[PDB]
Design a protein around this ligand. Structure first.
Ligand SMILES: *[C@@H]1O[C@H](CO)[C@@H](O[C@@H]2O[C@H](CO)[C@@H](O[C@@H]3O[C@H](CO)[C@@H](O)[C@H](O)[C@@H]3O)[C@H](O)[C@H]2NC(C)=O)[C@H](O)[C@H]1NC(C)=O
Ligand SMILES: *[C@@H]1O[C@H](CO)[C@@H](O)[C@H](O)[C@H]1NC(C)=O
Ligand SMILES: *[C@@H]1O[C@H](CO)[C@@H](O)[C@H](O)[C@H]1NC(C)=O
Ligand SMILES: *[C@@H]1O[C@H](CO)[C@@H](O)[C@H](O)[C@H]1NC(C)=O
Ligand SMILES: *[C@H]1O[C@H](CO)[C@@H](O)[C@H](O)[C@@H]1O
Ligand SMILES: *[C@H]1O[C@H](CO)[C@@H](O)[C@H](O)[C@@H]1O
Ligand SMILES: *[C@H]1O[C@H](CO)[C@@H](O)[C@H](O)[C@@H]1O
Ligand SMILES: *[C@H]1O[C@H](CO)[C@@H](O)[C@H](O)[C@@H]1O
Ligand SMILES: [Ca+2]
Ligand SMILES: [Ca+2]
Ligand SMILES: [Ca+2]
Ligand SMILES: [Ca+2]
Ligand SMILES: [Ca+2]
Ligand SMILES: [Ca+2]
Ligand SMILES: [Ca+2]
Ligand SMILES: [Ca+2]
Ligand SMILES: [Ca+2]
Ligand SMILES: [Ca+2]
Ligand SMILES: [Ca+2]
Ligand SMILES: [Ca+2]
Ligand SMILES: [Ca+2]
Ligand SMILES: [Ca+2]
Ligand SMILES: [Ca+2]
Ligand SMILES: [Ca+2]
Ligand SMILES: [Ca+2]
Ligand SMILES: [Ca+2]
Lengths: 412, 413
């Protein structure tokens, strides 16, 4: 049993072993025995020269073609010596070399992972196969640098097995929606042959962000006589989510509908304008809470305060709250014939009321408490001179433009 | 200024105070004064009888109609004494009673809140309005018991303002999709009247649950001769989420496609069957990783092991690795004429190799190293008796049913 060692992929005619030296044969003795190689499929790679006694290579010795993945790879063929008709077992071990690159069964691996994927989730990676064996076979995986993922390689007896990609830092689609990684598989030769696997990690969206107003409280000041449908304000709300999770619509929070009903907020543009007249008397200010809803149950809040300014638009009102229609012929000076109830719905200088009566007639109005005015007479009237009187009392407020209300009293 | 006090909703003619008693005037003296009602806009609700000297009520005194929510509610009107022509204002305070229930401006407040809503979110609630005043006005809010929500009321000097509903424990649509609450507003009378506002909080779905397999590792044993397309297994994964987030689709994890390519997995029904033949050789077992995907990027993993049974289906193979065709006429007994290399691809009793040669001829086969067989000579054959030889060697394996391979070798003298 003769055993040699030759690397694989040798050049044609490369020396393997000299049979002459190990059998003790010269050139002549080899010629006399008539040594020649016994053929079978595999011995076609080996060539025996009967004069030099040197078994050399006859062709390409691709050990991956011969033994695939086994070790060691030894080719056994018989040498026929015609003299004694003697067979001689020659076994030649094929040492492995590195001439192949690890091949992934694809070029781009595309995966879908939600942004709420719990960190630590594992993804088995495609296996890369190095055609060589031994030290020139698959030796290591390397995941391209990225904060969100890490590489986990199980140490196996034959080599690295079952590569896995682990989620480290939690995903955020609003920051990075697509992560490109590169899984490089490398053997252990010199130089090292690396096969690359492109990884396309796509992040799926989840409604995790409610709208956000530009201001927490929206203030505005408006005249009371402001016409209907005047644009009071425009709010602004943003949503960073994708698609239906990021389309906002505004609406009124059901607070006090007696206040909300006096206003109008466009659901799409968010422009608040007035729908009903604005009266300073009932409401000086208008507090309202507004709401912005996206498409998936999230919402945001904001406050809107509509302060009403005052301008003279309400005239005082005079109520004929007292009338003594029958007034004596001999009444003394200082007797009240009528008491009136005066009231202006406005404030400041626009809300004070003065009383006016024609000054020729004897009776006059004096100052009394709380816009009440007492009509007391200052002289005597003749029974013959005046039988019937149709008097016109004038109540004017003092804020320009002044507003006035008249009351007419008939007396006898 | 004389001030009296009468409650609201009094019967007609009810006593307040005797004006004759307070003015120190008798029945006659006031009649001489000519005391009479000064008739203000709302003064007809007051009735003065000019004989008893007691200004009493004339009708229903509904102060909620009078002063609404103001305080205090005092009615001022003048008493005219015709004697000195002197006016005297009488003020009567209207004492409040409880005849109204707090009324909400709607019947059901319905809201949509995502299951991922950050706890602590506040929702201003619709105001309930009690027409009464004082202690008979709105006094308290009460939110019905619920683990996820609580009531927060801002108090005022007069009473409660801006009731707000706060989310405490985070919502789960997979557990509770609809929450019904009852907001009761109550005054402070005796008995207390409560108005109710039904609340309908709907929870919107969010992909917060990954698939879940029924088994972590799927083991199965199938004969090697199994035909193509035979149903091997069925996996099952459930998801409690709603809609597209809760129906699963199965697929192979991209690991080794040389193993996956030999199989077929329906993505929807999840029934695994074979697509290519299964040979016990090359692969004794078949390990595979499977993946369950919902509709929104979540996934689950499971293992499936398809173990191949072993069956005698590969016959041993005989290789004529050596043949010395030229053989002397006078060769002695014991000389090898041919060496054969036989090999069976199975194991155990199905993998042991036996050799058979014609027993009439002198040559016989003896076993040497491992699986090699040597054709040795035992006697002499005459060239005249036999010039050419067509040999039939049959190799049989030892596992039932036995498989045999025949080889024919031609030799001459
Ligand atoms: C030793 O002798 C045997 C016969 O005893 C030889 O085997 C024979 O080989 C021939 C092929 O040349 C077979 O012919 C076959 O005919 C059938 C008819 O249907 C068909 O299958 C094919 O057309 C085929 O040619 C013949 O059947 C076969 N003998 C037997 C019994 O099956 C053998 O070749 C001889 N070996 C040597 C080294 O001389
Ligand atoms: C306000 O909203 C508009 C509408 O998209 C947007 O363009 C703008 O950026 C927002 N305001 C700010 C300060 O970004
Ligand atoms: C004075 O007022 C009374 C009130 O009814 C009316 O009837 C009368 O016609 C008025 N005087 C004149 C001259 O019109
Ligand atoms: C298996 O999946 C089906 C699919 O709807 C389901 O009906 C069944 O409940 C699942 N298995 C069990 C044990 O529930
Ligand atoms: C592995 O390393 C080789 C060099 O040995 C590169 O060519 C390859 O791209 C990978 O980075
Ligand atoms: C990995 O690297 C190879 C070259 O080694 C490229 O061809 C491939 O596209 C991937 O980037
Ligand atoms: C408020 O309280 C009253 C009793 O005071 C109940 O009748 C009502 O249903 C609500 O609970
Ligand atoms: C609360 O209770 C009132 C009765 O007080 C109902 O009318 C309402 O629908 C809610 O159930
Ligand atoms: Ca090679
Ligand atoms: Ca290599
Ligand atoms: Ca190699
Ligand atoms: Ca996010
Ligand atoms: Ca998102
Ligand atoms: Ca959103
Ligand atoms: Ca006004
Ligand atoms: Ca005014
Ligand atoms: Ca005004
Ligand atoms: Ca009442
Ligand atoms: Ca009440
Ligand atoms: Ca009341
Ligand atoms: Ca949930
Ligand atoms: Ca869900
Ligand atoms: Ca899901
Ligand atoms: Ca088989
Ligand atoms: Ca088998
Ligand atoms: Ca077998």
């Amino acid at each position: 049993n003769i055993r040699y060692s030759v690397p694989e992929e040798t050049d044609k005619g490369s020396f393997v072993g000299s049979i002459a030296k190990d059998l003790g044969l010269e050139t002549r003795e080899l010629m006399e025995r008539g040594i020649r190689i016994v053929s079978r499929g595999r011995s076609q790679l080996f060539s025996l020269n009967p004069r030099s006694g040197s078994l050399v290579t006859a062709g390409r010795i691709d050990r991956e073609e011969l033994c695939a993945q086994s070790t060691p790879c030894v080719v056994s063929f018989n040498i026929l010596m015609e003299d004694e008709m003697k067979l001689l077992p020659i076994e030649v071990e094929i040492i492995d070399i590195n001439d192949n690159t690890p091949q992934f069964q694809l070029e781009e691996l595309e995966l879908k992972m939600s942004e709420i994927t719990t960190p630590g989730t594992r993804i088995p990676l495609p296996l890369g196969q190095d055609l060589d064996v031994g030290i020139n076979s698959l030796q290591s995986y390397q995941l391209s640098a990225n904060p969100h993922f890490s590489l986990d390689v199980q140490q196996g007896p034959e080599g690295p097995q079952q590569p896995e990609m682990v989620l480290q830092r939690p995903l955020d689609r609003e920051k990075d929606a697509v992560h490109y990684l590169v899984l490089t598989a490398s053997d252990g030769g010199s130089p090292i042959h690396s096969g690359t696997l492109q990884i396309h990690v796509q992040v799926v969206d989840v409604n995790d962000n409610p709208p956000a107003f530009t201001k927490a409280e929206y203030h505005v000041s408006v005249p009371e006589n402001v016409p209907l449908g005047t644009r009071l304000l425009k709010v602004n709300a943003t949503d960073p989510d994708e698609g239906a999770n990021g389309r906002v619509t505004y609406s009124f929070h059901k607070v006090d509908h007696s206040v909300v009903r006096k206003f109008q907020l466009d659901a799409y543009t968010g422009e608040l304008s007035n729908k009903e007249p604005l009266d300073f008397e009932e409401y000086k200010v208008y507090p309202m809470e507004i709401q912005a809803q996206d498409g998936a149950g999230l919402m945001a809040r904001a406050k809107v305060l509509v302060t009403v300014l005052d301008v003279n638009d309400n005239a005082p009102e005079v109520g004929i709250t007292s009338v003594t229609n029958t007034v004596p012929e001999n009444f003394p000076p200082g007797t009240t014939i009528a008491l009136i109830s005066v009231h202006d719905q406005d404030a400041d200088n626009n809300g004070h009321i003065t009383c006016s009566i024609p000054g020729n007639l004897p009776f006059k109005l004096e100052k009394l408490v709380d816009n009440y005015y007492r009509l007391v007479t200052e002289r005597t009237l003749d029974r013959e001179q005046s039988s019937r009187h149709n008097i016109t009392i004038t109540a004017t407020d003092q804020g320009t433009p002044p507003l006035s209300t008249q009351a007419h009293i008939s007396l006898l």
